[PDB]
Design a protein around this ligand. Structure first.
Ligand code: HEM
Ligand code: HEM
Lengths: 714, 714
């Protein structure tokens, strides 16, 4: 048989495997392989041209609906991106992870295995010059254009992954298609982008299986919100999407379909959901168990969805697949649509409960009425929403590659202004460094501030970072954890230095505040390393610009607000998970390994950049002196730890003999002396001959983070 | 709140996580770090001195029994190495994985956490000069020595790991201290080195908690047997070991012992089994539940154990912990032992069912009585057994470091003779290759033999390999998988070449057959790459020697016989687990990553090197031509797969269109097209631009395997 993981014996075991994924890069791709350069060689048109032909080139193992694969492809692209949550920036189409488990075997993704397979020849024909990730999205764009609708634009740059993202928590559900995340529609558990396990957003039949339109709209609203989309956008996407294709439910899924890809027989070769009677189906295709098309020309762009929905009355019912769907009360629409694979046959259009919801909900109804009224208005709303949906997790404008990239930059891209001046030289740097070090700013003020600036970055959707100095703008400048008043004192001193330096210059040379913040932090760290007798030259990359409120959709940054900050030992008093889990989860967003996280926090405590300047976890007598004191003192058996009475996050380190309190700390600090893998790393650094190693590891990690968002020069 | 791994949703999903461990090296240690080197700097004498000192430096947080930690440390090293199994070479102490879960939290390791803790100060003092793995075994040694007994020797070199070995399969059970592996004592499930999940070998209370000295001996023998130990060794170890220390269990641990390390509070800093009524008590100490010493002088080496067990008779009785144990029927030995912690108290000796199993079982008594007669024979066997027990998973002599390594090289180290001649230069290396390609031996044959010669290497215990050429000796020359008669022929031709080469040498240069075997493969791989238009030169390391049958424990090599071999597509028709699972398991013994495996096999099928020259998986038109034809043809949807009629491992690839039989394959071939992650790699290599990459990735993987045992170069 198979082994048994440690998570099985102890459920609460810290999941450090998410950090290990950051150590190596599974897959056969070279380390020095620059995907950007490869795509830069791709001939996008030839690919789009080939996809054009595929659109109507039906293979027998999965005959095209209406002799056109367009609709199916669209559903595939939309699902590839639709798993995206704003809370952590994970999911999405950035890695093309729909291809790996568990996503590839999600109920909602039924038969998308066949759609991906169809792209296999083209994918092999261009090879590394196009990722599955970029390809699935482009397959949607081409599909949409081929059926008569122009797209706002397209961009390449999405690098394929070679495994699932272990960091993503898809929910508490223990079974697919079931939910334990909401008691009332619109009341889903924090951080989740769906209302049901295995589904992209909501249950197509209605909440909890009930054909309640009004209720459906509440979950549609919340789920989409948690995906960075409003009413206009949601309505446009749902309506523009269902303008094409159909839903397949010839018969009940729970009896006619085989195991999902992951549970399928090896001779299936990655496919799954094999239909008992056959998979080369047409008039018997089953996907979700719901049957029928939405419009009269499922392969053409038009006002078919909106007109069918708004101009006719619909009644709930049980379809041939035994699932909820709606039909018209009139005989006008009956048999007005040709059968997906048959000539001598017509089909009556249908409507999902989630569709009736755009009509029953009063706000979705205004928006929909507007659209029906102005096709041009609905067209662009859909064009722009589609473009945002499929590029939302790619990062700033610098990352979007190719000839079809819109000259216009959207706000959600968190655009950065150009630096219209000359970059400071090696001489100005040392100059400004001393200037800063001469101010009344402590090493802890400079470190804390630079940490607040760069720590907002998250590798999941390439958002945040220290470039742009958004830390001084809303909402970051007012986040509790950034100690607003404290931050203001520091930012003032730096802005003055920026002004003074900018004025005295007589050659167009200027220095951005965003740049000074980080530099002032490298200086503080160097100084802390100097107070311990270590000469270190921290690499500084000048070039960061200062973004303005006009380049910041303030409300969207609230998503990057940390609930826990290891480095500053901050724990919001309401988190559900234990501090350490969030610690690890946040660490993963900064691409840290268990070791890098360990060196960071450890080195930090010796310095003392704590929130509200506490001493929690500061196991040293010489603060602002970079040493391995944290590990040495933490591991001292002479000291014993116990929870602090009437405390929720505080712990006391007592002398096992005298009983006297020696230190105070949190789970963030203690986790490195309890978890077996981490304690093992704390022993290396806590050894008598490793201080220099720690100093250097801490610096490396500190430098890595400061530059995380420096995409332009990667 | 934690990501529900793909493991739960699909309990049968291939576990590629073990191959992922080979892609990266978790832990804060530099790539260019040579432990064996940092070790050479270590003043071993200083370490031993501090170790003997620590032996009588009791810590208030865990008082030293009898005022000496020696016995406890002996157990620590005992359990540290006693988890080794010859079947896969896993377990052991060569990595010191006792520190990591699940091992560190196994019921049989209760309180061993305090034992490893007592060694923290020392480990810290010496840092990278001594690994935890080497320190634990060195502590057991030093523990015995200070108790009047010299050790046969000691060798450092065990590299510290920073995580468990996810590749180890400890058993099918779903709970600790319960077994579902054996009905009758001695009918244990093959592949397992213990009779009960969570134990090192067996249950100290006898099979299923039943004090049946006879049945206990039946398992005591199969366990030690599966751990490379015979009767004499089994008796000496157990007896010599129990000549020290006692068994603790003042009360029932089932109700007086806190959570095990992994499930203990964070304040307990990695420690576990917190005594409910005072952990610093000492007098009140609970570990396994059984209470009492074996000898009247627990801190003195002598015949106390064998004397008490043989000179008197014992009877069953539930001890002060609810566990089965024995005591003297006669009241002569009553209070013959001083109390471990109470200066004003005495205590009566006790024996475990495992200690009575040695008296009852025939072949055991014979040994025990021979020992009692000759105290020296007991010594020579125990000393040598203790040395074999703590070093058998470290590899050949090449890997034994330090100033205390015995000069006499043991048989279990699988010694290799010294080349008594001059190596061959690039000049001769070139000739030899051109000469092997002039023979009538085909690429297939050459490639196949080289693989048979090296594939036996396993990273777990560093055994097997192409150096020594055991392939031509017993038992390997007669392994079904090697095709004896075929192997016979190939070697003959190679030997004739070795001959004609050595005889023509006007100097002292001579070529081993071992080198020639590997030099044949390399040249054959280059030829195959040449027929594909790629000119490649594989790096070759001359210097291997030919081992003789004299210094070869033929029987102990059966554990290296594989039941599956993807390169040659060999599948034993008795393997319980699915072929692909074994394929992965073995690939881990070779330290290959998902990618490497994939390239290896895919490239190999284009060459055609199957067991019995079958056309299984050979999806190519031009064999012995290294290309990416395997991936191109495995991925072609124009082909459909299905299980073969009346065949266990066979699958046929028909033409979706015609229905004509296109290819034939086995799960080993088809897995690369079914598993999500593996398929991701196959698509890379099967692209219209991957061939050259595959050829190079193939050579590098092949070149790697050929050198797995070349420690001498490391
Ligand atoms: C409130 C969120 C929505 C709900 C619950 C939902 C619903 C569903 C259901 C149940 C199906 C049928 C699949 C099948 O049986 O084959 C389908 C697909 C389809 N979806 Fe939607 N979806 C949502 C929206 C979106 C968006 C946001 C768009 C695209 C911008 C779009 C896309 C399409 C197209 C083109 C098809 C038909 C594919 C074909 O004919 O193969 N969907 N959807
Ligand atoms: C069939 C195999 C054996 C069984 C099931 C077994 C049994 C046990 C158990 C139940 C304990 C006591 C744990 C406790 O209460 O603290 C103990 C330990 C002890 N064992 Fe064994 N053992 C085997 C053999 C061996 C071997 C081969 C060695 C090492 C050469 C060894 C040496 C020791 C020592 C020195 C102690 C006492 C530790 C102390 O004072 O704290 N044993 N054993």
């Amino acid at each position: 048989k198979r082994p048994k993981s440690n998570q099985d014996w102890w459920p609460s075991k810290l999941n450090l495997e998410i950090l290990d994924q950051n150590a190596r890069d599974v897959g056969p791709v070279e380390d020095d392989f620059d995907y950007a350069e490869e795509f830069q060689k791709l001939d996008l048109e030839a690919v789009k041209s080939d996809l054009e032909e595929l659109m109507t080139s039906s293979q027998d193992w999965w005959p095209a609906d209406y002799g056109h694969y367009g609709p199916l492809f669209i559903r595939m692209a939309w699902h590839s991106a639709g798993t995206y949550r704003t809370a952590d920036g994970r999911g999405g189409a950035a890695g093309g992870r729909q291809r790996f488990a568990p996503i590839n075997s999600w109920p909602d993704n039924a038969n998308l295995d066949k759609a991906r397979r169809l792209l296999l020849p083209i994918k092999q024909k261009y090879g590394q010059k196009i990722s599955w990730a970029d390809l699935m999205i482009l397959a949607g764009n081409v599909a949409i254009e081929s059926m008569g609708f122009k797209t706002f634009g397209y961009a390449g740059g999405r690098e394929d992954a070679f495994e699932e993202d272990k960091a993503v928590n898809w929910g508490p559900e223990d079974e697919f298609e079931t939910q334990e995340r909401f008691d009332e529609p619109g009341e889903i558990q924090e951080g989740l982008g769906a209302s049901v396990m295995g589904l992209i957003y909501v249950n197509p039949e209605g909440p909890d299986g009930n054909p309640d339109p009004e209720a459906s709209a509440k979950n549609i609203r919340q789920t989409f919100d948690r995906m960075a989309m409003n009413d206009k956008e949601t309505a446009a996407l749902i309506a523009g999407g269902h303008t094409f294709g159909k839903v397949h439910g010839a018969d009940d899924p729970e009896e006619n379909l085989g195991p999902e890809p992951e549970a399928a027989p090896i001779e299936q070769q990655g496919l799954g959901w094999q239909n008992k009677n056959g998979n080369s189906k047409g008039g018997e295709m089953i996907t979700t168990g719901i049957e029928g098309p939405w419009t009269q020309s499922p392969t053409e762009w038009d006002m078919g969805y909106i007109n069918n929905l708004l101009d006719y009355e619909w009644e709930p019912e049980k379809g041939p697949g035994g699932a909820w769907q709606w039909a018209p009360k009139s005989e006008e629409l009956k048999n007005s649509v040709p059968d997906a694979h048959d000539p001598d046959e017509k089909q009556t259009p249908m409507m999902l409960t989630t569709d009736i919801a755009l009509k029953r909900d009063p706000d979705y109804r205004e928006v929909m009425e507007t659209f029906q009224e102005n096709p041009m208005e609905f067209g662009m709303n859909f064009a722009k929403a589609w473009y945002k949906l499929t590029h939302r997790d790619m990062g700033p404008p610098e990352r979007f590659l190719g000839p079809e990239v819109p000259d216009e930059e959207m706000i959600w891209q968190d655009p950065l202004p150009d630096a219209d001046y000359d970059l400071i030289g090696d001489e100005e740097i040392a100059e400004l460094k001393e200037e800063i070090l001469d101010s009344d700013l402590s090493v802890s003020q400079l470190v804390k501030t630079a940490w607040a600036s760069a720590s907002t970055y998250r590798d999941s959707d390439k958002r945040g970072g220290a470039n742009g100095a958004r830390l001084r703008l809303e909402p970051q400048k007012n986040w509790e954890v950034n100690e607003p008043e404290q931050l203001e004192t520091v930012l003032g001193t730096l802005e003055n230095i920026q002004t003074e330096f900018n004025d005295s210059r007589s050659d167009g040379t200027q220095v951005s505040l965003a740049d000074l913040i980080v530099l002032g932090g490298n200086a503080a760290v160097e100084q802390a390393a100097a107070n311990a007798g270590y000469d270190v030259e921290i690499p500084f990359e000048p070039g960061r610009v200062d973004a303005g409120p006009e380049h910041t959709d303030a409300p969207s940054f609230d998503a990057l607000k940390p609930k826990v900050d290891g480095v500053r030992n901050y724990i919001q008093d309401d988190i559900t998970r234990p501090a350490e889990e969030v610690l690890v989860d946040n660490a993963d967003l900064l691409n840290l390994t268990a070791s890098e996280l360990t060196a960071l926090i450890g080195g930090m405590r010796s310095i003392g950049a704590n929130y509200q300047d506490t001493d929690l976890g500061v196991f040293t007598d010489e603060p602002e002196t970079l040493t391995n004191d944290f590990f040495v003192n933490l591991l001292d058996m002479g000291t014993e730890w116990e929870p602090a009475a009437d405390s929720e996050h505080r712990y006391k380190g007592l002398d096992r003999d005298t009983g006297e309190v020696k230190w105070e700390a949190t789970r963030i600090d203690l986790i490195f002396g309890s978890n077996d893998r981490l304690r093992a790393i704390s022993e290396v650094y806590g050894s008598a001959d490793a201080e220099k190693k720690l100093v250097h590891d801490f610096v490396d990690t500190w430098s890595k983070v400061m530059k995380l968002d420096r995409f332009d020069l990667e």
